[PDB]
Amino acid sequence: HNCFCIQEVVSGLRQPVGALHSGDGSQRLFILEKEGYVKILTPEGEIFKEPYLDIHKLVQSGIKGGDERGLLSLAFHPNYKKNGKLYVSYTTNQERWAIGPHDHILRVVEYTVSRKNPHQVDLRTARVFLEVAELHRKHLGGQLLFGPDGFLYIILGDGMITLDDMEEMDGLSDFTGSVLRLDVDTDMCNVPYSIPRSNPHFNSTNQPPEVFAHGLHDPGRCAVDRHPTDININLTILCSDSNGKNRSSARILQIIKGKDYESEPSLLEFKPFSNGPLVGGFVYRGCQSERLYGSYVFGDRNGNFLTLQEKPLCLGTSGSCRGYFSGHILGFGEDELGEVYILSSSKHNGKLYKIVDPKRPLMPEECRATVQPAQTLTSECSRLCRNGYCTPTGKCCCSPGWEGDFCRTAKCEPACRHGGVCVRPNKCLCKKGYLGPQCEHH
């Protein structure tokens, strides 16, 4: 019969959680390691010695078992090629919040690539967007993505947070179990992000404006469809929810183009799975396989695959085109060419497997993309905007006590006198003979 093939691309990874591309012409594959590493895979086939991101000490990763505490997701800005903007979701043990009893906080942070190195990011550019208190080490979610509408979606799990401990607290979270929707493209320096005008709860200040839809418990890696087959819909995220009590179910969320949402869409739930919890899914929109195109592909820990109503995917080890892998499946991946990957470790050594349709060429003629080697940023907010941050749109925002177009001039709120010069915020250089923080005493 007609099966597919898993092909070993590279090995020796430290608990691979997922893989994605940057959407910038270069065909780099960014592999995320649970411990708080991001590693680059060149289209030639190397893993660059130096990691793209090493937020090592910041994250307390999961030791062994049913843990879920490492690095969670990564998303590149749709305009990354011009603004070098990352977004990362991870778990940190390092805060002094006066919340009381809690396990950790789930942080969502943006970053920027170093202007003097396209293959590594500078840790100074870190900007927290969100921090979410957590009580347990399961049902966390964390998956990040950008819709074809340009907004950032954060998919957050249950956290196993009961209604007890919800009220029994000077609150926390209330973003948990929801899909958030954020407009990152802001010109306003008052906030890290803007609320989409079409989000429900845009005004009504009694429900959170960031919450686009709720009802999620333990979501897997959710399948994200950017070309939904239903003309009416323009983005579809479909999640496998573990539900906890093995009552596994699929929840589907449909985003409609140019519609001002009255209230939240319903997380439409159905049960097409016969048994067992899945790691997650992906929608294949690649070039290498004609017949797979469009199929929502879901998989479990052991390596059993489905297609949406569930139709199994055999991986016939026929001839030399294998179908067996080592250990269990941990996450999934995507090419800049649309080709899909599976990641699995044994429990050092982590593997990366590409999916291949044996009925079609390995590297087919119409699938070729002429590679564009990655480049340093050239934007005006780059190499000019000093002292303060630099929005995804290019608007240079100033850290307190700086003003001007590029935060070049320094502010002095008590005002420097006697021919004094304001050099840094409230710092003040006086001409000989004058003393005091504003040169006020002679």
Swiss-Prot record:
Widely expressed in fetal and adult tissues. Highest expression in adult heart, liver and pancreas, and in fetal kidney. Residues 163-175 are annotated as: Interaction with SHH zinc binding site. Glycans are attached at residues 203, 234, 246. It is found in: Cell membrane; Secreted. It comes from the Eukaryota. It is a peripheral membrane protein. Residues 380-407, 408-440 form the EGF-like domain. One of its GO terms (cellular component) is cytoplasm. Zn(2+) binds at residue 170. Keywords: Cell membrane, Cytoplasm, Disulfide bond, EGF-like domain, Glycoprotein, Membrane, Metal-binding, Repeat, Secreted, Signal, Zinc. One of its GO terms (biological process) is negative regulation of signal transduction. Disulfide bonds join 3-314, 5-321, 189-397, 222-239, 287-367, 381-390, 385-396, 398-407, 412-422, 416-428, 430-439. GO terms for molecular function: hedgehog family protein binding; zinc ion binding. Modulates hedgehog signaling in several cell types including brain and lung through direct interaction with members of the hedgehog family. Belongs to the HHIP family. Interacts with all three hedgehog family members, SHH, IHH and DHH. A flexible loop interacts with the SHH zinc binding site and contributes to zinc binding. This is Hedgehog-interacting protein. The lineage of its organism: Eukaryota, Metazoa, Chordata, Craniata, Vertebrata. The chain holds residues 214 to 667 of 700 of the full protein.
